[PDB]
């Protein structure tokens, strides 16, 4: 599993692979690991599928629950803190093998500078969190390959399209070196999922766009 998130001028992008495994066996090819949890936040989770999906679903319900109760959404700091509390709550089960870590990407409408309002927050199994000011972050079994790829490719990120391509290429490198991360399946037409978030909100990237970028990367690696 690999989830990547990176900041671009005016927004944030998050993408995740589609592979579900049990040991060495591939048990899913079209799986969704990045969820729009808020008008302005997406969450991608790595680890035990059941725990990950329960995290995303419960989290979205919690955010919208506060928003309807109090008439205003949580501050981004509040969102961070609630996700952290949720992870720490799962710590014991994580020690028993039901481990899931989230990666949070959001757009802070209350930020001073609308171009650096993108936010990327990573978490550990104890709920400790870090807001990444270096622009990118990844989580999952291929996260270090993806992060190191983005270290070299991040200088090319100037808008949503360049950041989306860098994200998809980092997922490509991740799948290239980690068998638990699935690469682009051109036979079945299955490609990573991506969410982009700017001032106008969080939208799902159509799969055909991700496909176009994937073919660009592939031919770039062939000749």
């Amino acid at each position: 599993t690999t989830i990547v998130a990176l900041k671009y001028p005016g927004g944030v992008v998050m993408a995740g692979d589609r592979r579900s495994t049990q040991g060495n066996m591939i048990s899913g090819r079209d799986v969704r690991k990045v969820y729009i949890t808020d008008d302005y936040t997406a969450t991608g989770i790595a680890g035990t599928a059941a725990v990950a999906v329960e995290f995303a679903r419960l989290y979205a319900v919690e955010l919208e629950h506060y928003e309807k109760l109090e008439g205003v959404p949580l501050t981004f700091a509040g969102k961070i803190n609630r996700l952290a509390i949720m992870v720490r709550g799962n710590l014991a089960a994580a020690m028993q093998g039901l481990l899931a870590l989230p990666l949070l990407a959001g757009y802070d409408i209350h930020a001073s500078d609308p171009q650096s309002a993108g936010r990327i927050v990573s978490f550990d199994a104890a709920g400790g969190w870090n807001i990444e000011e270096e622009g990118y972050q990844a989580v999952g079994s291929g996260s270090l390959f993806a992060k190191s790829s983005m270290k070299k490719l991040y200088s090319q990120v100037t808008d949503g399209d360049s950041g989306l391509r860098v994200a998809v290429e980092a997922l490509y490198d991740a799948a290239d070196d980690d068998s638990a991360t699935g690469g682009p399946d051109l036979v079945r037409g299955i490609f990573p999922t991506a969410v982009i978030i700017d001032a106008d909100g969080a939208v799902d990237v159509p799969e055909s766009r991700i496909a176009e970028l994937a073919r660009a990367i592939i031919e770039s690696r062939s000749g």
Binding site: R57, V61, E64, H65, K68, L69, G71
Partner: protein
Amino acid sequence: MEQAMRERSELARKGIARAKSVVALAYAGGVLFVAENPSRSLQKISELYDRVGFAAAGKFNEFDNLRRGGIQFADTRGYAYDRRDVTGRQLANVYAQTLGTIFTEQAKPYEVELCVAEVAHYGETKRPELYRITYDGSIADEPHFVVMGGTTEPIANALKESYAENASLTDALRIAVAALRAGSLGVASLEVAVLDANRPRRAFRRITGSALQALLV
């Protein structure tokens, strides 16, 4: 027994009659909520769930209690099964049960009247549903409009005379404020919101300030 329930019924009914009025009517774009409300931050109109909205008249803290309880019910059921299993009928039904228990068993009955509205999900054709739940748990399925709080007979009669199915948003708003004025009204004295059947997910949107002023002229 006879005495106690007579007195409780009268306390609640008098409490609701002394309060500001609220109208909810179905129009071509969904459901329109318009309530006499001078406040800037205290709300009588609320979102419950994706296609389900809430309106109330009477004592604020009490119908706000009922509002939060309804949001908990909706969110919990949607989590327990799926978002699509939550219906306006369910919220109206649980409100009926709840107000029955409050009316008979609480220290003081709630001086509230509730309206639960549901519009169709995006792209689907289904007539809007309006539910009226009174202080004793009485529940009514109403087809065109619901009036709650204050002197309801003049407003109900005004709507009975001036309501047409499928008016535009401006027409429905006009008919609504007119019906309210026939009893005891600009922007900073109204609270307006709609369940917009054309929104993809969350149908509840408020109409406030400059936009509302433009829809009133």
